[PDB]
Design a protein around this ligand. Structure first.
Ligand SMILES: CCCCCCCCCCCCCCCCCC(=O)OC[C@H](COP(=O)([O-])OCC(O)COP(=O)([O-])OC[C@@H](COC(=O)CCCCCCCCCCCCCCCCC)OC(=O)CCCCCCCCCCCCCCCCC)OC(=O)CCCCCCCCCCCCCCCCC
Ligand SMILES: CCCCCCCCCCCCCCCCCC(=O)OC[C@H](COP(=O)(O)OCCN)OC(=O)CCCCCCCCCCCCCCCCC
Lengths: 239, 116, 639, 233, 116
């Protein structure tokens, strides 16, 4: 495992009341529920955004809490990736230098940096837009280059708070297919929160949370999309 | 608050004024040094020192004045962030004070809920 | 709440934010009050120079007002422009266009007049200091007193009240011309027009620099050609600088970004996100700042060059500690020093004036200098007259380096030099490149050297001497005295002799040069210091507005994972480029302007000029550091 | 009717909005969404066409007199958080009422009610410069509603707001509109903020071709419903 | 900690240096007063100021050195009694929150036994 939470609980509110979480390497999972039920707050506590009051969390065997703000900055910038729903891009920078924004702090040679980008861009279908400013590309490309930025340094755990929050049906399907293919060929575990079962259908395990409690463990089962799409639909409707 | 600031910095303002007082003594005894020009020269530095003291009063007492919030019963909010190392250590001890208190209360609350 | 409480709160925010503006206003008021006090101070008449002290100060006083009113009007213009957001909100609240103006005027009055009163008190305190500074610079011994003059207070009140009247008119016309609809891409590729502008800006700057390198080389002959060249180089530099800030700076920034590839660090994001798109938005402001700063540095360095070499130049124009035109006054003066138990030596060196053809050894074209090398007046000194290097028959020596002489007169090391007297000419040969100057500039020209000939030839042509070429003197009288402290006693005794001021003393010439150029240095240095404060404050305010425009970029960077400390390093590099590019081009303009005219003033140019930029850069980097502190505050509150 | 546009400068649009109907206009860069808002807000840019606010005749003489009907009967919400730095949050909401000679007590519970429904009371005395942008935008919306108006104009309020702040602000506005009926005329550039409303009109060059209204479907269904319409343009 | 105290009083260090810079500038510019005597006195004053600076640091920073009692189980060690008003207010706030920690532990111990 690479993630482990031992009854993680947030006293603010009470949003989290103790939930056990754990995932395996190279796994596609989603956590969701009702609006305002605390699904978003899980990403802010699993990542070191607002810390926590009760419980402990482990990332790749290393403690995710009980640290100061000095080495915490290094940990997020090295082992954690973020795919925000808002593009969070820079208008002054083109796609090429926007993707290689976080890789700069690593301070590696340009020879390998131009090789990592080529592998990432060819695996995302965004190579042709290597020198196009964000204002000259569609919203789907903006999300794709945001995903490439999170995947450029090959982290361990990547959080995607509603990646398809502003994308069309075709763009959401294309991004999800790219992300699922990227995870399979890179063996990097990604977790996300989704308000729609269509985006979370590409997952392997689906677990729902509200008022800080854990319900069910929806294993994929290794069948086609038809079985999983109906299963996630009926469970969400019942819940 | 002005009285407290002046009392603390009494040694420092005395050191600044000691050299000015020294000049008014040697000038009054040295024929080669004119007292009138020294008096203007001292006056220019006194004017600068007074302006410097007033500027440093607000900067060096803003943190400690806001620290009075913790002491009284309105301690339900936060204070200004530290900017200089000496008051940063005071804030660090204050921050360690709340974290230990929060940890103790959380642990005690968990024990109380466990026996129910 | 009540309107009065809002006005008081607005004043507190303005004082906290625009503290540099208040300091600049206080400094300008205090400096102007001191200058007016100096003008009407009866002790300022003790200075003696070509330009009267009162007239020079009054001219500086007018220049100081212009350089301050322009800064104040411009500063207030951008203050209201950045306040236009709350101006429109007030119009949306329901107040008429007069009440909102009254609120803005009331806050401005309580701030402008408050700083004016403080500045008057500061000016009264520093009035003695600037008077002592001027006396020390021009080297005059007198008593400086601290007094308060009613006229100076009246004059500074009237001028600054009139300045604020212009501010009120500008503020009122801004409110009336702005309607309700006032409270609600930049990034693109490089175009062909930007290509031509960028290349032309660099070409024009280098073209002007090359002309300066060959301005006095000898290409131009007449004064009209020199004047039209000066107009061309001034125009080329100004146009080139304006084009450099407009399109050239974008291309250089674009080139390095492309050369660096797509791998840019944090420092290359913030730095390259401003100079590409924000430098060209205020090209006119940057050009004016760069041009005036370069002119101020150039004038200050040239004045210091003359001041540094004033003693050498005073020794240059003379040949001894004293120069006498007639023998009768020398007899009167020698007896005065004889009874003063001071040993002195009087030297009598006859000189000869004639026409000499030097074009045979004049390197290159003989049209470089203003006149005819074939027929020109050159001082001739006999071999026995001086005690330097013995000269044989058919040989000559040229005495006097006088660096300006060498550039205009590019002497060679060998050749045949032809002297054309009233009768049969004689051919000589010279080496040149000497130091000791045997003739004072009262017979020979300021830069024209003196030829040395064997005394046998000098005694030969005594009967055949040109009456056409001889001024009045022939024999030269030079008086020197023992030690150095006797200079003052001799000078004070010499003053009563030259009642008609027909004589010429080394100390008097040095003192006159010291006072004249010292006053110019005092005027230029203080005016440049005032411009330095105003330019730094203006650039600080421009960075203040730019910082607010770049807040979303900092928010994105913090959300990505970059810490505040990481952004500090990028900001420091970006501010270094923003505050360094105008300085670097400004220093380059000053350096190439001084290098093209340094020989016209003195002999040492490297030491005084280096000190000026070093002092200027140190006092200019303070505003850059203050801008960094404001940027640190902004990014701290960004997220 | 309440706000009826009759050949509303643009080419002439005929729209019908009832009381308390959240609406949004969708356009392109050349369509002039902001220009339509300015003519719809109808202060200075008015050449042809008439706007009837509950049957009131328009084009009296001047914008300054037009400024004093909107002062008492029109709120304004913007994207730059037009909040005075020196002003406090409580006083900022009370700033429009400070000019009128009031008892200073009527504004008290009016602020209390606004801070109870919308919710600003937790930071009543907190300065705007030390709070997040999600609360400054919310405070500005409350300041507009203190004029107890029936029509509120708000151009792209979620311009400098993230997704969380945009979603938080819109649901606060949506329930506030339900609490007190008031038409909220708004313009939008991102389809995310154009789904919480109840009616969207698409302008290609300044005309009303197709309008989309919600119903049993909402949120994601409405979001994709207008995506295909915007993709048509 | 030397690097911390110097950053603390860097404003006062600069003010004293600027005062001496003004002290030299007036003496050099003004011809009535000497400059050699001022230079010798300034060197003596700087030497005295350095000695005073070391003496001031040793006496003043001792309280903040003892503030490190919360780094480990050294919490039992008592903070030295402060003398300056700034430190007195800091100690009063610390004592106030310590009593706050004491009273909440007693309240929880009251609640734990009451529930039984
Ligand atoms: C031999 C060699 C020796 C050589 C000798 C000389 C040596 C060389 C020169 C030395 C240069 C080095 C200096 C660098 C140090 C930098 C300072 C620093 O670290 O500050 C950081 C720090 C910034 O911190 P921060 O985190 O950004 O905090 C933000 C502010 O602090 C937030 O603001 P705040 O609250 O702190 O302050 C607000 C406000 C507070 O002030 C006030 O509120 C009081 C005044 C308000 C005025 C308005 C009145 C309002 C009330 C009136 C109401 C009623 C009136 C009604 C009217 C009538 C109507 C009916 O401040 C002001 O605006 C005050 C202005 C400064 C007062 C000084 C006046 C100038 C004296 C004249 C000089 C004379 C020289 C003449 C020529 C000399 C020739 C020999 O600065 C401050 O703390 C602020 C201090 C104020 C400015 C000080 C700096 C000076 C400006 C820099 C100029 C650049 C230097 C270039 C050359 C020098 C000048 C020519
Ligand atoms: C040679 C060319 C002409 C030069 C003319 C110069 C005229 C005087 C202009 C003012 C120059 C002041 C220089 C000496 C300042 C010494 C104090 C200092 O540097 O303090 C630094 C400190 C800010 O640093 P800190 O508190 O660490 O916080 C950093 C983040 N904010 O600062 C502060 O906390 C603020 C307090 C210090 C700044 C205000 C001091 C104003 C003094 C003006 C009095 C002028 C008296 C007459 C001068 C005669 C003419 C020179």
């Amino acid at each position: 495992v690479i993630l482990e939470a031992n009854k993680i609980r947030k006293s603010y509110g009470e949003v989290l009341k103790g939930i056990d979480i754990h995932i395996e390497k190279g796994e596609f999972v989603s956590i969701m529920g009702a609006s305002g039920s605390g699904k978003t707050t899980l990403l802010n506590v699993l990542s070191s955004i607002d810390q926590v009051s009760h419980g402990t969390i482990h990332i790749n065997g290393n403690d995710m809490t009980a640290m100061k703000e000095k080495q915490l900055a290094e940990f997020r910038k090295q082992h954690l990736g973020f795919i925000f729903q808002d593009y969070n891009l820079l208008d002054t920078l083109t796609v090429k230098e926007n993707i290689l924004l976080p890789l700069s702090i690593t301070k590696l040679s340009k020879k390998e940096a131009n090789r990592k980008f080529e592998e990432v861009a060819k695996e995302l279908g965004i190579y042709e837009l290597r020198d196009k400013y964000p204002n000259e590309i569609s919203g789907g490309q903006k999300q794709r280059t945001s995903a490439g930025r999170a995947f450029i340094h090959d982290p361990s755990i990547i959080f995607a708070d509603e990646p398809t929050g502003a994308l069309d049906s075709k763009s959401a399907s294309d991004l999800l297919n790219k992300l699922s293919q990227l995870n399979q060929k890179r063996n990097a575990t990604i977790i996300m929160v989704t308000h729609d079962p269509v985006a979370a259908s590409y997952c392997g395990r689906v677990i729902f949370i509200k008022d800080g409690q854990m319900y069910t463990q929806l294993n994929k089962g290794g069948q086609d999309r038809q079985t999983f799409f109906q299963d996630i639909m009926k469970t969400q409707g019942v819940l | 608050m002005i009285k407290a600031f002046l009392i603390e910095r009494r040694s420092w303002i005395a050191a600044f004024l000691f050299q000015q007082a020294l000049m008014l003594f040697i000038a009054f005894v040295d024929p080669s040094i004119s007292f009138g020009n020294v008096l203007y020269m001292v006056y220019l530095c006194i004017l600068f020192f007074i302006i410097f003291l007033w500027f440093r009063y607000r900067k060096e007492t803003a943190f400690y004045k806001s620290l009075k919030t913790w002491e009284n019963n309105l301690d339900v909010t936060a204070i200004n962030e530290p900017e200089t190392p000496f008051e940063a250590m005071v804030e660090r001890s204050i921050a360690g004070q709340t974290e230990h208190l929060k940890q103790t209360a959380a642990r005690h609350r968990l024990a109380l809920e466990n026996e129910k | 709440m009540n309107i009065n409480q809002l006005i008081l709160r607005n004043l507190k925010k303005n004082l906290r934010n625009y503290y540099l503006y208040v300091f600049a206003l206080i400094f300008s008021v205090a400096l102007y009050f001191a200058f007016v006090t100096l003008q009407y101070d009866p002790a300022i008449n003790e200075v003696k120079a070509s330009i009267k002290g009162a007239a020079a100060i009054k001219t500086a006083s007018i220049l100081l007002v212009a350089v301050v009113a322009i800064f104040i009007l411009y500063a207030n213009t951008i203050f209201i422009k950045r306040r236009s957001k709350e101006i429109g909100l007030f119009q949306l609240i329901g107040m008429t266009k007069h009440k909102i103006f009254r609120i803005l005027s009331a806050e401005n009055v309580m701030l402008y007049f408050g700083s004016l009163a403080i500045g008057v008190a500061a000016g009264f305190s520093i009035s003695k200091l600037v008077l002592m500074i001027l006396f020390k610079i021009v080297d005059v011994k007198a008593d400086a007193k601290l007094h308060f003059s009613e006229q100076a207070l009246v004059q500074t009140v009237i001028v600054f009240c009139g300045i604020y009247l212009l501010i009120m008119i500008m503020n009122y016309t801004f409110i009336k011309k702005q309607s309700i609809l006032s409270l609600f891409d930049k990034v693109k590729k490089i175009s062909f027009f930007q290509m031509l502008i960028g290349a032309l800006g660099i070409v024009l700057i280098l073209t002007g620099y090359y002309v300066s390198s060959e301005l006095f080389g000898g290409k131009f002959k007449t004064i009209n050609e020199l004047f039209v060249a000066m107009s061309f180089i001034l125009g080329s530099v100004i146009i080139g600088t304006f084009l450099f800030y407009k399109g050239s700076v974008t291309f250089i920034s674009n080139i390095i970004r492309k050369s660096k590839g797509g791998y840019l660090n944090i420092s290359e994001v913030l730095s390259l996100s401003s100079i590409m798109f924000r430098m060209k938005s205020n090209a006119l402001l940057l050009t004016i700042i760069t041009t005036v700063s370069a002119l101020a540095i150039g004038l200050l360095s040239l004045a210091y060059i003359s001041y540094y070499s004033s003693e050498k130049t005073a020794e240059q124009n003379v040949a001894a500690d004293f120069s006498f035109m007639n023998e009768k006054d020398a007899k009167l003066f020698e007896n005065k020093l004889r009874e003063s138990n001071i040993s002195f030596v009087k030297k009598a060196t006859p000189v000869l004036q004639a026409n000499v053809d030097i074009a045979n050894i004049m390197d290159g074209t003989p049209k470089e200098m203003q006149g005819d090398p074939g027929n020109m007046q050159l001082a001739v000194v006999s071999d026995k007259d001086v005690k330097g290097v013995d000269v044989a028959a058919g040989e000559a020596v040229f005495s006097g380096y006088t660096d300006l002489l060498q550039k205009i007169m590019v002497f060679k090391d060998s050749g045949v030099i032809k002297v054309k007297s009233k009768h049969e000419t004689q051919p000589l040969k010279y080496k040149g490149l000497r130091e000791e100057f045997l003739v004072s500039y009262t017979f020979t020209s300021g830069g024209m050297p003196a030829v040395i000939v064997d005394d046998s030839l000098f005694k030969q042509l005594d009967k055949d001497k040109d009456p056409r070429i001889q001024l009045a003197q022939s024999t030269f009288i030079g008086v020197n005295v023992k030690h150095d402290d006797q200079m003052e006693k001799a000078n004070e005794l010499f003053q009563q002799v030259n009642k008609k001021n027909e004589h010429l003393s080394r100390l008097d010439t040095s003192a006159a040069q010291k006072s004249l150029f010292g006053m110019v240095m005092f005027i230029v240095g203080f005016l440049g210091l005032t411009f330095l404060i105003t330019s730094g404050c203006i650039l600080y305010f421009k960075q203040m507005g730019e910082s607010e425009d770049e807040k979303p970029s900092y928010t994105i960077l913090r959300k990505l994972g970059f810490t505040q400390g990481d952004l500090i390093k990028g900001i420091r590099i970006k501010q270094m480029y923003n505050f360094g590019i105008p300085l670097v081009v400004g220093l380059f303009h000053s350096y190439f302007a001084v290098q093209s005219g340094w020989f016209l003033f003195g002999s040492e140019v490297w030491a005084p000029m280096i000190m000026v930029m070093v002092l200027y850069t140190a006092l200019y980097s303070i505003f850059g550091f203050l801008s960094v502190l404001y940027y640190k505050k902004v990014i701290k509150s960004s997220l």
